[PDB]
Design a binder for this molecule. Structure first.
Ligand code: HEM
Ligand code: ZNH
Lengths: 294, 108
């Protein structure tokens, strides 16, 4: 009878220091369980997890998004486009037993922020307040983007998340991390060489390398460079579109600018659909393990 | 030495997974994102044979021995600030010894 208002409520008597302990715990496990995915580690899959739980938002009706933590329910957990994310969820469950007070939504999003900061990325301001919601508010499968599309699809897909041209090119730069796995998505290979350290390699590779369209083993087409890298059709579409292209060239020249827009965009992605009452604390900037002597 | 010495089979897989995308070890090697590291032990930094290093790697100019190399591979940007080697670091000593032992053997 009235739209959904998702009010942020800080977990009962919790503060910055409480949340810095959960970060430390995730960040240390990232350092210790370093064998995963042939030594890429859990960093890339945790930021993909942070994005996929947030990517379900629909601005029009305020359904989906990070708030509800509804990834824990089998309907969203088993979404075909969430394949490979179980490994990210498994990494976070021992930490959740350690801190059962933190909400699911708060943990998945913190996991993404922690991963980026740990992988030498920019500091991303984070906020608490996500509250776990019932099994009936779990969003239907299919709200996440498909990789076999062009720039037009990407521009309009992101309008749904309230993201402009500058924000979508910035958010896509997260593909400097990890790889595509044929068993999870039908595409195989990395976007770059430094798969576990956050740089602007994505953009540098996009326009500096020689791209040839080819078929992989899952019968899907992808752009392959002679250097062993790959690009998804939507990644390549960022250089086909004149407007997206001049923001790709901007970031390839200035990493700082890229480090400032992603953090603004990534924060905005994780905070989408949540209303923070004015008594709520200012966003937290967590210290990395390196800043704490580790 | 201060650094012990480990498995050269384990270090092979550590190189293959964490260093191969950017480096080679071979006699006459395809220079990539990073330099061909053959004959690294005993030479200086920024020390070419053809490659464009950042002025930081050249000006550190340390002889690459097993010990200062281990300190480097723990945190590349703390040891040589301003370097463009985008690597997080081998935080486990066994991994460093297993790798350097393979490296000493492969880059002979
Ligand atoms: C465990 C793995 C690795 C080892 C053993 C290793 C080792 C080294 C060493 C010893 C140097 C100095 C060369 C010299 O002074 O002549 C160096 C430089 C460099 N490495 Fe690697 N590296 C590793 C991984 C990486 C990765 C993953 C990348 C690529 C994304 C990379 C990129 C480079 C670059 C670009 C330089 C030149 C640095 C500069 O000019 O500032 N390295 N590396
Ligand atoms: C347009 C749109 C889009 C699309 C379709 C996509 C897609 C994709 C795919 C297909 C993949 C693979 C999977 C597997 O595992 O195989 C990925 C991954 C991915 N991704 Zn992403 N994405 C995107 C966006 C994005 C964003 C926004 C972000 C964030 C921020 C990202 C981040 C990511 C990461 C990090 C990864 C990796 C992971 C791993 O490696 O595991 N991403 N991706």
């Amino acid at each position: 009878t009235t739209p959904l208002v998702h009010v942020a409520s800080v977990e009962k008597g919790r503060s910055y220091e409480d949340f810095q302990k959960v970060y430390n715990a995730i960040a240390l496990k990232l350092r210790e369980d370093d064998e995963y995915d042939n030594y890429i580690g859990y960093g890339p899959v945790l930021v993909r997890l942070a994005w996929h739980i947030s990517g379900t938002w629909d601005k029009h009706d305020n359904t989906g998004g990070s708030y509800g933590g509804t990834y824990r329910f089998k309907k969203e957990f088993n979404d075909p486009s969430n394949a490979g994310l179980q490994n990210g969820f498994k990494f976070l469950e021992p930490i959740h037993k350690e801190f059962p007070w933190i909400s699911s939504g708060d943990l998945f999003s913190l996991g993404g922020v922690t991963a980026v900061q740990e992988m030498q990325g920019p500091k991303i301001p984070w906020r608490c307040g996500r509250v776990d919601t019932p099994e009936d508010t779990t969003p239907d499968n299919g709200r996440l983007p498909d990789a076999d599309k062009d720039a037009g699809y990407v521009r309009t897909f992101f309008q749904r998340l309230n993201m402009n041209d500058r924000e979508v090119v910035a958010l896509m730069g997260a593909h400097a991390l990890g790889k595509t796995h044929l068993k999870n998505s039908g595409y195989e290979g990395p976007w770059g060489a430094a798969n576990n350290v956050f740089t602007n390699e994505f953009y540098l590779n996009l326009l500096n390398e020689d791209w040839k369209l080819e078929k992989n083993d899952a019968n899907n087409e992808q752009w392959d460079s002679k250097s062993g890298y790959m690009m998804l059709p939507t990644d390549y579409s960022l250089i086909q579109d004149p407007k997206y292209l001049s923001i790709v060239k901007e970031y390839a020249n200035d990493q700082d600018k890229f480090f400032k827009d992603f953090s603004k965009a990534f924060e905005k992605l994780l905070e989408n659909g949540i209303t923070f009452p004015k008594d709520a604390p200012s966003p937290f900037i967590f210290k990395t393990l390196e800043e704490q002597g580790l | 030495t201060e650094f012990k010495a480990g498995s050269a089979k384990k270090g092979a897989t550590l190189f293959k997974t964490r260093c191969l995308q950017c480096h080679t070890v071979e006699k006459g090697g395809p220079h990539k994102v990073g330099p061909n590291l053959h004959g690294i032990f005993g030479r200086h930094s920024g020390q070419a044979e053809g490659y464009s290093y950042t002025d930081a790697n050249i000006k550190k100019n340390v002889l690459w021995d097993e010990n200062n190399m281990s300190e480097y591979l723990t945190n590349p940007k703390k040891y040589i600030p301003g370097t463009k080697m985008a690597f997080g670091g081998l935080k486990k000593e066994k991994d460093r010894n297993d790798l350097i032992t393979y490296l000493k053997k492969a880059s002979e």
